[PDB]
Design a protein around this nucleic acid. Structure first.
Lengths: 501, 1208
RNA sequence: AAAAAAAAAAA
RNA sequence: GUA
RNA sequence: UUUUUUUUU
């Protein structure tokens, strides 16, 4: 007995690569579980969507020992009906409730099954990269076990002991399904279809997996290509599934590409982003603002410019974008002027990468004052020696977050966010969580994770890599994951799912 | 009128004609608004300019009534006082005037087009000036001023006191009042537009200054100084100038107590006892005296120079500690207004809820075990204040993990689930789905969870909550700002419930906290009274400014690591929609992704920690929807105080362990924290104590908190209770008798008089003269709370008037065509104030038939059914014991009008009003909702209890609805539903049900007497033998331990007779509490006990059904069996007195302590419960009659009917 | 018109 | 001194 | 258990 009924919702199990074996004890058991699902869905809808005695239902179904028989009747009429259903099965034991360990699966479990979970030992099937494993008891009994064809495994189905009623085929040959079908004789069989990719790279420390939400034809990459080739599709649609720091870099090549299931976006990410889009649409709100944090080197500006473009084209309004190093490049030029210009065009004209930041100057002087000038000198220090310097960098960060003077950071974002000619909706970036009291007043703030080893991406660039690595480490030391973690494909799916006009 | 030239003005006793005159004159001041204008303003009053008298100690002081020009002739409205931003999205960032500015009340016009930003701003300033200034607690604001003026007139017997001159100079504008408040429009209507704008609040200011004169705190010259200060503060902006010098004009007292330099103080024991008195220097150390220079400079350049001269006078002329206490209470009356401080929350938002970074930043801990979305599951600090806090908080996790495992969390969530307002409001789809009555009732939180109980186990409920914003809601509080606080919905409250459960269990494992330790009496101040009588002590009330706002996200992470350690050590499956499962995980060092077993509580804690959104979203009427910057503590959560308590005790005790590890001693003895209030007490030499105090303040600065070092040798502050050298210094101006926060202005009159009694009892051991406050409460209850208007049907109007007008007066109104029902008032006699279930106020000497007066009831007298004894006390019990009769003398009780008062009490209006609201709620929907709500935790118990209840119903009589355990959830939902509305024809049936009781009651009424009030009759005779004073009468004569505990006062002499309160000496506890009330917890007139006793006198085999239908434990079963056996055998007598613990703040609760004062003859002990009964008699008589207790030994005479009733 | 702690009364 |  | 009220965070 699964949580979601495979006879009604067969297409969802087809999405995982799990096909129904054609119509035996397992064949009786799946139909009995479907009748139990229909009976529970009937009994739930008579009392506010709830079940009247869920421990009794859970015992009668999962354990299969309790029999209720009338020989009040009103309070136990549903239980007598369920008892006369289960007694007519003559099963030796009870039907164990079966859940997958996926997030997309648990959001589609019905309410009555969720009420019965709290009085049941479920059979929780793990997932590797979203696909439930096929070497389980129930998924072998009720479903077709897959068979993978590779370049080496490729043969006629007569060579192995395959059959249409037991095995389904996973084409991993890199060839068209019609060519495999009418060239080798796989015509009677059935193919599981996946929509994404799974790419293994050659990392600095080992090998690195990556899951992409694009098809292998949409993603123009083959085995042996480059990381900087087709980088934008990977940044917009890719998620590395290893522990950070995963040593991915601009030199990593492809070891293997396989078709694989598309990732499903999270609940809280789409909830916070739809909260922001509700703030964008509604006329009740004068200023809408999104606060995005990322580590220094995640490539966050290049995606959020595309996000501002897609939001402008989908919403019909004008969407601005204040960069992460906007205040530093502002304050490097205006810390001496008593009455500076807070206008949006003047600020936006200073967010180019040729302008030097104030914090990078101060950190350059701080690294010079200890004698640190090369990246190899900074790597060769101890952790306590780094933290002793990062505390002085925090002493120079606190002087701009403490008060609200005419050059404070809170005054800067107040004057830019509340200007005459500034856009209505701003996408404002930040480095660390102490800027929450300083970046403009919101109710949506997220954290952006991309496929960039941010300690490797900052030692692979010029213009003072020591200062960039030092400021990355300081900002990491001031940034936990205490807001909602959001990936870029989730930020694009938030616009694609929100209905406009 | 001439109300200071009465018989009560010169005798203060209720004779036959003094009571008639004082009832005739106060009913004049309540009815018409013509006589109040004549009472407050008349040409017979001559104004005064210069004045001279004494201050609070006896020193001569001279002052002058000075009205500023800015109150008399206000300026026109300046629109630059409330600016905006450039985009007009909100008010300006650093805008100065945060409250209402003094301008001319007609100068605020609205010449803009509607639906314009400036139109919204001027409409909101209209809302501020006309609506947000009316705050009156009991009556209209011109009736609450006549009460104060009348009480001052009758106390001082004259009129030439300066507060009358302030009233006439500020409010005599024309031949009418300058303004009035209307309950029909719910706003103030200005009759003279040329008057000031802040001028309606000076009514409440004059009421508070008159209350302080009645207190004994201020004299008349000090009232001149106070009113000059409050009129100087309104010269630019009243509330802003009040808050700017709110602490400067108070904190001078440490310097005065230094310059005294010599004090003889009480000495308190370890066990809440006064054991000695000692003489010691009050000279502060060298590091305290260095702050005096800065405070002198700021005091010289900020304050009004007359009040600054008064502070320098107080520093210079004080000789003992009592002088410093008296001048400090007077400056408390001069700096605080006694009003609730309120404006538009769009103004005060940016100063009450906006997050701030004050000190150095807080870093993160190293993540050691991470989620697959890289959220944190386990984390540990490298170095900083996080390691310091965790070095103390990581030795309790292994015990809190055991304590959390034995808690059923769904039943804890149902018991935690309140009837308050949830965050989100149901939209039209769910309103179409459920019925209309459910949609009306769904403004509760428990009805809300009973509606959405179908998806309690669904995980997407949590993510659905992250789409809804957090609502902001206002508060009001005296002496402080507005404090915009948050209110969040069920699921955001549910995420913060498991860290609330985890952080609450720390309170049982140490003594750093203060949550479970309060009682309302001197046990609240046991630690402060003990640790100020010691020597070589350093006392410290460190002040963390803005605890809710200064906590960033990284400061919350210090609590998050503690919660995640406790959650990782425990084993809790099935918390909410979460369950224990093998969860894929990232670790440190492990390149790949591991798999570990993660329970439900640690999933809930990790998802709560890694999805944090604080920012409250207030929907304004000016700007639309206003949000806040992120990074405040959300402050409306379940763990909104346990967080602060755990974090502060972790920082302090970790500093203690860090100093012990660095080779330094720690001399910290106790800390007490309730969140935002630390109280540190050190002991040692000055170097050690100062070093440890500086280290504690610096380690609070390291965690990102702006502290204010308030440390000394002899004073200590915790939870607004000041203890200076074994002596309580109460804050009398914190209690506002005249202003009110919610401004419900309750339609109930017995409840209003109970509210007044509660405030007057709370003002008892912080006031200096309680007799004047008694008289103030009498005149406010006799002017403000007389008339009572209710709507009566047109067919019954003259019928009810003809039935009711026979004993007390009534007021009629117009007949109001084109409508059905018109309202009519219920003006009442003064004897309603003194009766049980009526007023229950301490009375005055009533003259008896024989000329001898009744005794003056003190402020310590009882309430409840004991107040029926005043009938027999004015009926001359002294004659009753020698005539052997129980004749109540109804003629004299009709001369004083007690019989109409008891008639109006016997009408029982409020119970009928509540029952006709109860007669509407449909039990089918309530049963359906609570049956849906029972399914979340602890199954089987409700059904077993209801099965036993139906069994006892079918083989017995019945059981009631609430008392059965299975119906308690239905009962709570049904009682939350009925508190919604009263708008309609329910008022017509109010008029109908109150019509049929007055037909039956007003045939003829005479006072019914029970046999049970034969024990109210008894008296006491004064012998010639002087009793011996308790030996702490000599220790507590120097430096009185409250403001009314002075040498010779009634509180001091009652404390010298009855002695202090004791927690160990419980001599008679079963009999006293049983004939007062409960056996153990269950009272005798409790429906549980009444239904159980009815089953008890029935067939006794039904008790097996009873204890299961109520679902009581075995110990509760034994308690109820012993209660039955004790109520049958000699539970026939009961006395039912009520004394509040705040009323006896230093005195004793136990009536045994009055046995040594009364000589009872031994031929009166004819039953086993005579001794405790007689001790109640003597205890209540000695507390009731302290004001004429010169110290002789008493002797109780009894009545033969009392003895026959005690026998049987 | 939120959450915690202590206190007084009524159905 | 309403609706 | 509810409702009202007070002190306090």
């Amino acid at each position: 007995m699964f949580a979601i009924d495979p006879l009604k919702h067969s297409k969802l199990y087809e999405e995982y690569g799990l096909y129904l074996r054609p119509h035996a004890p397992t064949i009786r058991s799946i139909k009995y579980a479907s009748l139990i699902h229909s009976m529970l869905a009937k009994h739930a809808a008579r009392h506010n969507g709830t079940l009247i005695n869920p421990r009794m239902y859970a015992d009668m179904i999962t354990l299969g020992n309790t029999k209720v028989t009338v020989t009040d009747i009103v309070t136990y009429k549903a239980l007598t009906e369920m008892s006369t259903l289960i007694e007519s099965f003559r099963l030796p034991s009870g039907l164990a409730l079966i859940i997958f360990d996926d997030e997309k699966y648990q959001s589609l479990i019905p309410n009555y099954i969720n009420q019965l979970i709290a009085y049941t030992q479920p059979h929780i099937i793990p997932t590797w990269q979203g696909i439930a494993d096929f070497s389980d008891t129930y998924l072998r009994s009720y479903f077709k076990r897959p068979f993978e064809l590779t370049a080496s495994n490729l043969a006629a189905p007569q060579k192995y002991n395959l059959s249409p009623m037991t095995r389904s085929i996973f084409n991993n040959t890199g060839r068209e399904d019609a060519v495999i079908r009418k060239l080798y004789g796989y015509g009677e069989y059935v193919f599981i279809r996946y929509e994404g990719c799974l790419i293994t790279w050659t990392g600095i420390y080992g090998e690195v997996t990556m899951m992409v939400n694009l098809s292998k034809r949409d993603l123009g990459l083959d085995v042996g290509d480059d990381y900087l080739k087709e980088y934008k599709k990977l940044l917009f649609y890719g998620v590395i599934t290893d522990a950070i720091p995963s040593g991915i870099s601009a030199r990593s090549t492809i070891m293997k590409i396989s078709p694989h299931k598309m990732m499903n976006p999270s609940g809280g990410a789409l909830a916070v982003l739809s909260k922001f889009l509700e703030a964008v649409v509604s006329t009740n709100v004068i200023n809408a603002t999104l606060v995005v944090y990322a580590e220094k080197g995640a490539g966050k500006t290049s995606f959020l410019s595309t996000y501002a473009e897609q939001l402008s084209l989908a919403s019909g309004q004008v969407v601005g974008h204040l960069s992460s190093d906007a205040y530093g490049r502002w304050l490097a030029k205006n810390k001496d002027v008593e009455e500076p210009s807070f206008a949006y065009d003047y600020v936006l004209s200073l967010d180019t990468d040729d302008n030097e930041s104030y914090y990078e100057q101060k950190a350059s002087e701080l690294l010079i004052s200890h004698g640190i000038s090369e990246v190899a000198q900074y790597e060769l220090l101890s952790v306590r020696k780094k933290i002793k310097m990062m505390d002085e960098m925090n002493e120079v960060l606190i002087a701009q977050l403490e008060n609200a003077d005419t050059h404070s950071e809170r005054n800067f974002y107040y004057m830019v966010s509340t200007g005459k000619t500034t856009p209505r909706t701003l996408i404002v970036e930040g480095h660390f969580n102490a800027q929450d009291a300083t970046i403009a007043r919101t109710d949506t703030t997220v954290l952006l994770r991309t496929i960039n080893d941010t300690t490797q991406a900052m030692r692979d660039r010029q213009r003072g890599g020591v200062v960039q690595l030092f400021l990355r480490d300081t900002y990491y030391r001031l940034l936990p994951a205490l807001h909602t973690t959001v990936y870029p494909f989730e930020m694009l799916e938030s616009i694609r799912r929100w209905k406009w006009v | 009128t001439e109300l200071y030239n009465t018989i009560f003005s010169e005798t203060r006793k209720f004779t036959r004609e003094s009571f008639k005159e004082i009832e005739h004159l106060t009913a004049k001041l309540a009815n018409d608004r013509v006589a109040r204008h004549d009472f407050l303003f008349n040409n017979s009053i001559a104004l005064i300019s210069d004045y001279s008298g004494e201050d609070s100690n006896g020193n001569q002081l001279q002052a002058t009534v000075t009205i500023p020009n800015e109150i008399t002739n206000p300026k026109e409205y300046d629109p630059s006082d409330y600016p905006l931003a450039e985009d007009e999205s909100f008010f300006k960032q650093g805008h100065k005037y945060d409250y209402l500015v003094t301008f001319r009340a007609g100068s605020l016009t609205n010449t803009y087009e509607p639906k314009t930003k400036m139109y919204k701003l001027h409409a909101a300033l209209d809302k501020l000036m006309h609506v947000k200034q009316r705050k009156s607690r009991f009556a209209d604001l011109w009736r609450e001023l006549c009460a104060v003026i009348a009480s001052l007139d009758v106390w001082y017997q004259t009129t030439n006191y300066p507060l009358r001159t302030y009233v006439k100079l500020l409010f005599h504008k024309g031949d009418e009042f300058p303004f009035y408040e209307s309950p029909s429009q719910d706003k103030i209507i200005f009759n003279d537009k040329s008057v000031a704008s802040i001028l309606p609040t000076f009514v409440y200011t004059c009421c508070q200054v008159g209350t302080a004169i009645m207190s004994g705190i201020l004299t008349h010259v000090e009232s001149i100084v106070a009113m000059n200060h409050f009129l100087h503060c309104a010269k630019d902006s009243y509330i802003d100038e009040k808050l700017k010098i709110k602490g400067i004009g108070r904190s001078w007292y440490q310097e005065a107590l230094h310059n005294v330099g010599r004090a003889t103080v009480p000495v308190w024991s370890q066990f809440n006892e006064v054991i000695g008195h000692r003489t010691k220097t009050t000279s502060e150390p060298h590091f305290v005296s260095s702050t005096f220079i800065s405070l002198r400079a700021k005091r010289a350049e900020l304050l009004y120079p007359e009040f600054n001269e008064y502070i320098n006078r107080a520093l210079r002329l004080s000789k003992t500690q009592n002088d410093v206490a008296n001048y400090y209470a007077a400056c408390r009356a001069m700096t605080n207004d006694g009003t609730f401080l309120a404006t538009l929350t769009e103004l005060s938002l940016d100063a009450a809820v906006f997050p701030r970074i004050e000190q150095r930043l807080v870093t993160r801990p190293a993540v050691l075990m991470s989620n697959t979305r890289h959220e944190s599951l386990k984390q540990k600090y490298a170095n900083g204040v996080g390691s310091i806090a965790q070095s103390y908080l990581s030795s309790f996790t292994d015990e809190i993990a055991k304590r959390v495992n034995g808690i059923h969390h769904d039943e804890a969530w149902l018991n935690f689930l309140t009837t308050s307002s949830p965050g989100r409001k149901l939209t039209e789809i769910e309103k179409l789905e459920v019925g209309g009555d459910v949609a009306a009732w769904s403004n509760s939180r428990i009805v809300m969870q009973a509606v959405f109980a179908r998806e309690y186990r669904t995980p997407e409920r949590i993510f659905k909550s992250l789409k809804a914003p957090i609502k902001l809601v206002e508060r009001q509080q005296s002496d402080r700002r507005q404090r915009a606080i948050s209110g969040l919905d069920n699921d955001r409250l549910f995420l913060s419930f498991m860290p609330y459960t985890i952080g609450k269990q720390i309170y049982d494992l140490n003594d750093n906290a203060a949550q479970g330790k309060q009682a309302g009496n001197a046990f609240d101040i046991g630690e402060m009274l003990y640790w100020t009588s010691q020597r070589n002590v350093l006392l410290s009330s460190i002040d963390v400014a803005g605890m809710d706002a200064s906590v960033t996200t990284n400061t919350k992470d210090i609590y998050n690591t503690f919660v995640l350690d406790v959650a990782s050590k425990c084993t809790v499956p099935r918390f909410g929609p979460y369950y224990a499962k093998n969860m894929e995980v990232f670790e440190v060092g492990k390149r790949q992704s591991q798999v570990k077993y993660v329970n439900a509580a640690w999933q809930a804690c990790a998802l709560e920690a890694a999805n944090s959104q604080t920012s409250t979203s207030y929907e304004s009427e000016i700007f639309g929807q206003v949000k806040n910057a992120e990074g405040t503590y959300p402050s409306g959560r379940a763990d909104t105080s346990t967080h602060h308590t755990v974090l502060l005790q972790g920082l302090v005790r970790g500093n203690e362990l860090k100093r012990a590890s660095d080779g330094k001693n720690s001399c910290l003895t106790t800390i007490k924290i309730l969140g935002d209030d630390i109280m540190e007490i050190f002991q040692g030499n000055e170097n050690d104590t100062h070093d440890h105090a500086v280290s504690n303040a610096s380690i609070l600065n390291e965690s990102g908190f702006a502290t204010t070092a308030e440390l000394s040798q002899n004073s200590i502050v915790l939870l607004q209770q000041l203890v200076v050298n074994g002596t309580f210094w109460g804050f009398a101006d914190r209690i506002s008798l005249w202003t009110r926060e919610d401004t419900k202005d309750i339609g109930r009159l017995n409840l209003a008089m109970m509210e007044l009694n509660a405030l007057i009892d709370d003002l008892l051991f912080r006031v200096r003269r309680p007799e004047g406050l008694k008289m103030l409460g009498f005149f406010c209850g006799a002017i403000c709370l007389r008339r009572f208007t209710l709507s009566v049907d047109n067919k019954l109007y003259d019928s009810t008037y003809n039935n009711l007008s026979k004993y007390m007066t009534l007021v009629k109104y117009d007949k109001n065509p084109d409508f059905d029902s018109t309202l009519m008032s219920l003006i009442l006699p003064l004897a309603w104030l003194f009766m049980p279930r009526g007023g229950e106020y301490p009375a005055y000497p009533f003259e008896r038939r024989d000329g001898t007066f009744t005794e003056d009831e003190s402020m310590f007298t009882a309430r409840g059914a004991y107040k029926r004894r005043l009938l027999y006390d004015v009926s001359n019990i002294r004659e009753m014991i020698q005539q052997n009769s129980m004749v109540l003398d109804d003629d004299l009780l009709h001369e004083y009008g007690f019989t109409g008062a008891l008639l109006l009490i016997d009408l029982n209006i409020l119970d009928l009003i509540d029952e006709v609201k109860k007669e509407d709620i449909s039990p089918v929907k309530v049963n359906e909702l609570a049956t849906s709500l029972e399914q979340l935790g602890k199954l089987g118990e409700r059904e077993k209890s209801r099965r036993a209840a139906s069994d006892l119903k079918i083989r017995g009589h019945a059981l009631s609805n609430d008392i059965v355990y299975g119906y308690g959830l239905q009962e709570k939902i049904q009682k939350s539903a009925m508190a919604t509305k009263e708008t309609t024809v329910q008022s017509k049936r109010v008029s109908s049900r109150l019509h049929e009781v007055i037909v039956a009651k007003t045939r003829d009424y005479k006072i019914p007497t029970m046999p049970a009030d034969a024990l109210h009759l008894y008296e006491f005779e004064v012998e010639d033998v002087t009793v011996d004073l308790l030996p702490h009468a000599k220790h507590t004569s120097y430096s009185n331990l409250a403001y009314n505990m002075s040498f010779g006062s009634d509180g001091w002499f009652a404390f010298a007779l009855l002695g202090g309160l004791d927690r160990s000496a419980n001599l008679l506890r079963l009999d006293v509490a049983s004939i007062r009330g409960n056996y153990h917890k269950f009272s005798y007139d409790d429906p549980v006990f009444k239904q159980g006793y009815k089953i008890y006198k029935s067939d006794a085999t039904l008790l097996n059904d009873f204890f299961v239908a109520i679902s009581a434990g075995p110990k509760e079963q034994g308690i109820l069996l012993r209660a039955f056996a004790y109520y049958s055998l000699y539970g026939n007598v009961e006395y039912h007195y009520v004394l509040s613990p705040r009323q006896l703040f230093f005195l004793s609760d136990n009536p045994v302590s009055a046995e040594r004062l009364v000589r009872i003859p031994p031929s009166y002990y004819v039953s086993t419960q005579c001794r405790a009964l007689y001790n109640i008699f003597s205890y209540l008589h000695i507390l009731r009659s302290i004001t004429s207790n010169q110290g002789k030994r008493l002797g109780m005479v009894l009545h033969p009917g009392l003895i026959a009733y005690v026998r049987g």
